Each structure stands twice: as structure tokens, then as C-alpha cells.
């Protein structure tokens, strides 16, 4: 019985069927919102071929991964359980159906359908979340290179199921860096305040004042016309006022060129950090995986640290509390029984029954898993909270 | 109109360097993107009152407001607790009038009605309200020798 | 303002109108653009009475809606608690029936099958009172604990 119990998968709570599924969409970096809207409309029309769904709600320009014109998300709400009490009408079945149908239809971008966990705070399968920090401000390229080297050291020569070791950010995208020539701006009457004024007024919005709109106050904003902020050749053609009101093409002042920049920046405990995710391959304790990760990080120079985030935090602190609590409970039970029987001998006779219930519960769970998996399903039962509560109840009754 | 680098270095780092010493702080994070918006998240160890934590965080933030850019001060900086007890979702569909008109109608006629119900703790509306928008044509300004500051 | 008059107004170089602030997000429900609102329950508030009240108030307000508009409530988290309560009551009644049948089969009298029925609900009520004293609430986990006990 103890051997059977020691070989059970662990988790926190089982995934539920709340009645809705979640969808996320991404497009190539640097895409507009019209393409995102077209892809969302295609997804919405595709969501109508699944009778298990009732309402589809789509939100454009926003996602939990990040915010941008190439990101979108939606929520599909299913009919009540009674109307969809069949084999392939579960929530996970619908999610798989939707992902598979998206794969072969979406021509621009990719979408993924998932079923959210019961409680976001306590969710199984989160894996290992890591945050590399640099303690001496080496920069962004150096930290990205170190992160890539860590992923390679962790994936090939590692034990983390190399299919899951991956970064958790957003890849860079081209930009329009501008280099102003202060020497050249000084060779003429071109100051440096007018440059900023023109640059920030041309293609950016401005908040001026307020006005009473039929009872309540509202903002007044000034922006350039839409026809003047659509092309890269709409900036360099911004002649700057001179000392005598003359115009400088701004080509003789600044040089405009494409480069590659970061679209997002993160910081953890005061240090620049980049997120990462992983998961132990199989038959490996999380403790050994964490120790290997820590040693690997130490392998890097002095100035790059590691720090767990999310659910990894409560595992870093040793889980040597349940054993102590159970030992204390057993001691208290023995003392109470010894007081009741007036002997130090019978209480152990009573305590010899715990293994029976433990073995019964473990064998039942294992047999049910085997039977389910024997018909094509996946093992759904593990050593979660409900297992512990039921085991405690059976222990009490047998005692 | 602020890139991730500018937003971070000019607002988020300044705000974050001052949130040290708040009683019961566990760890903090910072996130910025090109959308022109960012946030700072402080997580507190259990057994700490959330109202006291929020008030102390607001008081700490009150001592650095004079060092941020002018635009950030004009728009303002918020402070709220991440806790929430979701109850339900309400949707208004018209198909005949634009989304801004529906947003205005909801904010001016419906939202105040549900806030007075017994048991409602807070209502949030998703979407931007109205404003007076002016669309300037730079060709005209160049023809008249004017500027945006004018 | 010119020396000779004929001033330059704000409509010679611009176009003034009424609009939004951001233009970033865009919501839709089944293909028709909508506007969504989220309702949060206050601490120490019944989650079923509040949903009923919200629905009734919306039904009342629907009369003055502009032509074309309508309202819907796609999601509501107050049904899970109701389902859990119904399950708890169903299991309580079924357990009472099973106990009655077993006791009558083994003891073979109707005077024995009343004591357990009288004494179980009192214990459940005592548990309810204690959990109320400690400042807890009624949720799915509490109902599952009652079913187990």
C-alpha cells in the first residue's frame, strides 16, 4: 500500500468545466489592427460550427501576454451542462476541437484555446518560472544572450522535457531610431527645444484642457490628421524653424534608419529581469530540478542572479511541515488512547490500522486510473487536496 | 507616446525606488510596453491588512509626485488593490449606434443605477468615454505660418 | 487676429468633432459591437439576492432604452453556489432515507428510525452556528465538508 501511494502524480486541484473556454490570438510583429480584426472575424465565424457553443465574445488590441495592435483574445460560453451531456461535449474536448480547427483555417497569425484553472492563484502545471536579473546593468543584448545560453544549457544537456523550455516575453521588432546632430543643429540657428516640440507634436497626441459636456467635465485633445502619420517619409520631411523662421529639411540635422528594439521591459526587485519557463522531464523531483537550475545559474558570471516567481516561490521553502504535523497528530492520538485504556500497550494495537485504509485508498485510485486509461482517456486522478481529505476521513472512521 | 525604455526609466524606476520599507512587503515587479502605459505591483506577506497597506503605499507615492514628467502628473497615478470578487457581466448591444454613444449612455444612465443596489461592491466599465477631438492638418499650418503650440 | 481684421479661426486649419480618448480596444458579442460592464460583490454579501436584484433592475430600466439596444448576461457566478446548495440538500434527504431503510431492516421497528433523523440535523445546525461565529462564509468547500460529515 505504501509503495502504491508513493507512486501517485501530484497536483493541487483538478481542472473543472466552468462552462467557458479561453482563446488567444497573435499576429506577426508590427501588424496593424485591421488585420487583427479580420482574423478575429474569421475566428468568430469559425466558432459557429461548434453546436456546443452559445456566445462568442471577442476583445481586440489586448491580451494577457501583452498589449498591442497584433494581440487579441476571446471567450466562448457554452450551453448548460444538461444540453451537452455527451461524450465529446466536455470543455476540454471543445477546446481541442477549436484549436484543431484554428490550425487549418487561420491564414495570418495563430490562436490557442485553453480551459482556465479553477482558481488562478492555485494552478497545477505552472512548471518552473525563473527570472534572470543582472546586478551590474550590463544591458539588454547581454542579458538576452545569457538567457539564451541558459536555455540551451537547460534544454539539451538537461532534464526539463526540452519541448517546454522556452522564453516568456515578446520578441523584438524594427523601429525608427533618430540620431540628431547637435553640431549640425548648431552650425545653423537650429535650437534643441524646437526639435523636441516638432517631434512630439507631429505624430503624438496632446491633452490641452477640459470642457463641460452637458453636466460633466471631459478632456480636450489635439492630434495631427490621420493622413500625416502613416508613412516613415512623414517625419524626415518635418523642416524645423530656424532663428529667422527658415525651415531646415531635418535631413541635414537628423538621420533616420531602421533598427531592432525591445517592445517590452520588465523589472524584478529593482533589477532588470527576463522571464523563463520550464518543467521537469519525468520521474524527477522538483527539488533536484531547482538545484540543477541554481547550479547552472551559478555557472554564469557574477552579476546574473536567479529568483523564482509565482508558484515556485512556495516550493523553494522546504515542505518539511506536513511530516512534522502528522507525527505530532499521531503522538497526540497515542497519548489519548493510552489515557483512555490505562495502558501503554493497547494504543499501538489500535494504531496498527492506518496502513489498511491507506492501501485501500491508494489501490482504489490506481485501479480507477488504470480502468479510465484503458478506454482511451487520460489519468485524471492524482494526489491532490481531495485525496488527503478523503484519506483523513477514512482514517477517522476506521480508528 | 512613450516607448517602453522611456516609460520605465522615467516613471517606473523612480516610483519603485521609493517603495522600500513598506511594512510587510514581500516582493515587487514592474512592467512597461509600447502602448503608453505601465504599472508597479507590490505583493505583501500574509497577515497584513490590505487597507493599511494601500493607504501607506499612497502616502509613500505622495512624496515623489513632483519629480515625474508633466504629462504623467496631468493624467494622474492611481493606486488600487488587485483583489476582486467577480459576480457577473453585463453587455449592451445596439447594431445601430456607434460604440462611443453606447459607452456614454451606459456611463450616464446605467452604471449609477447598479451602484445603489444592495450587495454591489463596485462596477467597472470597459471603454473610453467621450472627448473633444481636434484633427489638425499640418499643410494648413505651414500655409499660415502657425504651430501646434499656437 | 489681423490688423485689418479677417481673423483666422480654428476651423481653417483643423476639424473639430466629438469622439473618444484612446481608440485602442474594441469589443464585440457574436459579431455586433457591444459595451461590457463588470459587477463585483462586496464582502459579506449574498451572491444570489444580488444577482436577482441586478436582473430585476435591468429589466425595469430596459423600458427607456434607445431603439436598437438590448442587454444580456452571458456569465454569472451565482449559479454554482445554488447548485452546490441543491446537491447538499439532495444528499441530506437521500442519506436520511437510506438510514431509515437500513434501521428498519435490521431493528425491525418504526420507533428506532426516528432518533437518528431527530439528532442529525441538530448537529448540522450546530456546525453552521460555529462556522458563523468564527466569521466564515457559505461556499462550495463548506458544502462539500458538510456532505462528508
Amino acid at each position: 500500500g505504501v509503495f502504491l501511494f508513493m507512486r501517485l502524480p501530484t497536483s493541487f486541484l483538478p481542472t473543472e468545466d466552468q462552462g467557458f473556454v479561453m482563446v488567444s490570438v497573435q499576429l506577426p510583429a508590427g501588424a496593424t489592427k485591421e488585420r487583427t480584426d479580420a482574423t478575429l472575424a474569421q475566428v468568430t465565424q469559425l466558432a459557429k460550427s461548434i453546436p456546443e457553443i452559445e456566445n462568442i465574445i471577442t476583445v481586440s488590441g489586448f491580451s494577457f501576454s501583452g498589449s498591442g495592435q497584433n494581440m487579441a483574445m476571446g471567450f466562448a460560453i457554452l450551453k448548460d451542462w444538461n444540453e451537452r451531456t455527451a461524450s465529446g461535449s466536455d470543455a476540454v474536448a471543445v477546446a481541442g476541437k477549436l484549436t484543431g480547427m484554428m490550425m487549418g483555417t487561420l491564414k495570418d497569425g495563430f490562436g490557442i484555446a485553453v480551459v482556465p484553472p479553477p482558481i488562478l492563484e492555485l494552478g497545477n502545471g505552472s512548471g518552473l518560472s525563473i527570472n534572470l536579473q543582472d546586478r551590474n546593468n550590463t544591458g539588454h543584448t547581454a542579458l538576452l544572450a545569457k538567457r539564451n545560453e541558459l536555455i540551451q544549457k537547460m534544454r539539451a544537456s538537461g532534464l526539463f522535457d526540452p519541448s517546454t523550455v522556452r522564453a516568456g516575453g515578446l520578441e523584438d521588432s524594427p523601429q525608427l531610431k533618430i540620431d540628431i546632430n547637435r553640431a549640425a543643429a548648431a552650425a545653423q540657428g537650429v535650437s534643441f527645444a524646437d526639435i523636441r516640440t516638432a517631434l512630439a507634436s507631429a505624430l503624438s497626441s496632446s491633452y490641452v484642457s477640459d470642457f463641460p459636456n452637458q453636466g460633466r467635465l471631459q478632456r480636450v485633445m489635439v492630434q495631427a490628421d490621420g493622413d500625416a502619420r502613416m508613412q516613415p517619409a512623414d517625419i524626415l520631411n518635418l523642416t524645423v524653424p530656424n532663428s529667422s523662421g527658415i525651415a531646415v529639411p531635418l535631413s541635414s540635422i537628423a538621420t533616420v534608419s531602421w533598427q531592432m528594439g525591445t517592445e517590452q521591459s520588465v523589472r524584478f526587485n529593482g533589477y532588470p529581469a527576463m522571464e523563463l519557463s520550464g518543467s521537469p522531464a519525468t520521474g524527477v523531483s522538483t527539488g533536484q530540478a531547482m538545484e540543477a537550475v541554481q547550479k547552472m545559474v551559478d555557472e554564469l558570471g557574477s552579476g546574473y542572479s536567479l529568483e523564482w516567481g509565482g508558484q515556485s516561490r512556495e516550493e523553494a521553502k522546504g515542505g518539511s511541515q506536513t511530516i512534522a504535523l502528522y507525527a505530532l497528530a499521531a503522538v497526540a492520538v497515542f497519548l489519548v488512547l493510552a489515557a483512555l485504556y490505562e495502558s501503554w500497550s493497547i494504543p499501538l494495537a489500535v494504531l496498527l490500522v492506518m496502513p489498511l485504509g491507506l492501501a485501500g485508498a491508494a489501490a482504489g485510485v490506481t485501479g480507477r486510473n488504470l480502468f479510465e486509461g484503458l478506454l482511451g482517456s487520460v489519468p485524471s486522478f492524482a494526489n491532490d487536496i481531495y485525496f488527503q481529505v478523503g484519506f483523513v476521513t477514512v482514517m477517522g472512521l476506521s480508528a | 507616446g512613450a516607448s517602453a525604455q522611456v516609460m520605465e526609466g522615467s516613471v517606473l524606476s523612480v516610483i519603485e525606488r521609493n517603495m522600500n520599507g513598506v511594512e510587510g512587503l514581500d516582493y515587487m515587479s514592474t512592467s512597461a510596453d509600447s502602448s503608453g502605459s505601465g504599472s508597479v505591483s507590490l505583493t505583501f506577506t500574509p497577515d497584513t491588512d490590505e487597507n493599511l497597506a494601500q493607504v501607506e503605499v499612497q502616502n509613500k507615492l505622495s512624496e515623489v509626485l513632483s519629480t515625474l514628467p508633466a504629462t504623467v502628473q496631468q493624467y494622474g497615478v492611481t493606486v488600487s488593490k488587485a483583489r476582486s470578487n467577480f459576480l457577473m457581466i453585463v453587455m449592451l448591444s445596439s447594431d445601430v449606434q456607434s460604440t462611443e454613444e453606447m459607452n456614454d449612455y451606459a456611463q450616464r444612465n446605467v452604471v449609477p443605477e447598479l451602484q445603489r443596489i444592495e450587495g454591489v461592491g463596485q462596477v467597472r466599465l470597459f471603454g473610453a468615454q467621450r472627448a473633444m477631438r481636434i484633427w489638425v492638418d499640418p499643410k494648413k499650418l505651414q500655409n499660415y505660418n502657425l504651430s501646434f503650440a499656437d | 487676429a489681423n490688423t485689418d481684421g479677417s481673423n483666422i479661426y480654428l476651423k481653417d486649419v483643423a476639424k473639430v468633432g466629438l469622439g473618444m480618448e484612446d481608440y485602442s480596444s474594441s469589443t464585440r458579442l457574436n459579431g455586433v459591437n457591444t459595451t461590457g460592464m463588470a459587477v463585483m460583490l462586496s464582502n459579506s454579501g449574498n451572491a444570489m439576492a444580488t444577482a436577482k436584484a441586478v436582473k430585476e433592475r435591468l429589466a425595469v430600466l430596459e423600458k427607456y432604452f434607445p431603439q436598437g439596444m438590448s442587454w444580456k448576461t452571458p456569465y454569472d457566478t451565482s449559479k454554482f453556489v445554488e447548485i452546490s446548495i441543491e446537491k447538499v440538500i439532495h444528499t441530506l434527504i437521500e442519506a436520511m432515507v437510506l438510514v431509515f431503510v437500513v434501521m428498519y431492516l435490521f431493528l425491525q421497528n418504526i420507533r428506532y428510525t426516528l432518533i437518528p433523523t431527530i439528532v442529525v440535523p441538530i448537529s448540522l445546525l450546530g456546525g453552521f452556528a460555529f462556522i458563523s461565529y468564527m466569521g466564515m462564509s457559505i461556499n462550495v468547500l463548506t458544502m462539500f465538508a458538510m456532505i462528508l460529515v
Binding site: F20, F75, I77, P116 | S84, N85, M91, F126 | -
Partner: peptide, 10 residues
């Protein structure tokens, strides 16, 4: 931000 989603569904 947190466009249509609550904690959490739409």
C-alpha cells in the same frame, strides 16, 4: 487595461 474579462470571463 484588463479590457472585458473581470476575475475572470468576458
Amino acid at each position: 487595461a484588463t479590457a472585458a474579462a473581470x476575475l475572470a470571463a468576458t
